[PDB]
Amino acid sequence: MAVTSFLGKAFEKYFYDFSAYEQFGLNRFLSSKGQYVALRHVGFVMVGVNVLLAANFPFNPPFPTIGMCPAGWEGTWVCQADKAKALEMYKEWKKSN
């Protein structure tokens, strides 16, 4: 249906015609356009990392943290090393909250 054909025309203009590098005039600050896109990707990565972490911040990390804590917790079930014990501590915290 038309709704799909419209999105095709719109995405074409975005891919070719709409460039933020030109509309913001970043040529004043950046050396080459080929390098600008590299920074845009690293930004996309950092954005995605924070977004995925923000989707559900209250969780015990599966990865081994190197002696560091997220926030003023340091002793909550989020900070427990062994996951078997952490599950029991989280269940108690969850039924309360």
Partner 1 sequence: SSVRDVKTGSLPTNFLTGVYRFWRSQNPAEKPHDPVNDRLLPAVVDASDKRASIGTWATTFFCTIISCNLLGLMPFNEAPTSGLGFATGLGVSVWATATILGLSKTGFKFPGHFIPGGTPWPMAFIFVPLETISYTFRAVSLGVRLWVNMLAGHTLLHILTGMALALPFSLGFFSMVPATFGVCCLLSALVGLEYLVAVLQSGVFSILSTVYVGEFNHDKFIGPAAKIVK
Partner 2 sequence: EGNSVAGIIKSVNETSGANLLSSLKTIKAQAAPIYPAAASSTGYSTQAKIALFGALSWILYRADGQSKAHEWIVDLNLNVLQAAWLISFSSLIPFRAVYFAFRGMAPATASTLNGLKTFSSISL
Furthest-apart CA atoms within the chain: distance in Å? 57
Smallest gap from Cβ 95 to partner 1, in A, equals 25
Residue 5 in contact with partner 2, rule: CB under 8 A: yes
Residue 50 interacts, among partner 2, partner 1, none and using kind-specific CB cut-offs from 5 to 8 Å, with partner 1
Structure tokens at 66: 């190197």
The whole-angstrom separation of Cα 59 and Cα 83 is 11
* Binder among 9, 31, 63, 97 for partner 1 (CB under 8 A): 63
Candidates 9-17, 26-34, 50-58, 82-90; binding stretch for partner 1 (CB under 8 A): 50-58
How is residue 55 annotated by DSSP? T
DSSP output for 39-53: HHHHHHHHHHHHHHH
The CA dihedral of 29, 34, 36, 42, to the nearest 10 degrees, is -150
Residue 58 in contact with partner 2, rule: CB under 8 A: no
Residue 37 in contact with partner 1, rule: CB under 8 A: no
* Site residues, partner 2 (CB under 8 A): 1, 4-5, 34, 37-38, 41, 44-45, 48-49, 52, 61-63
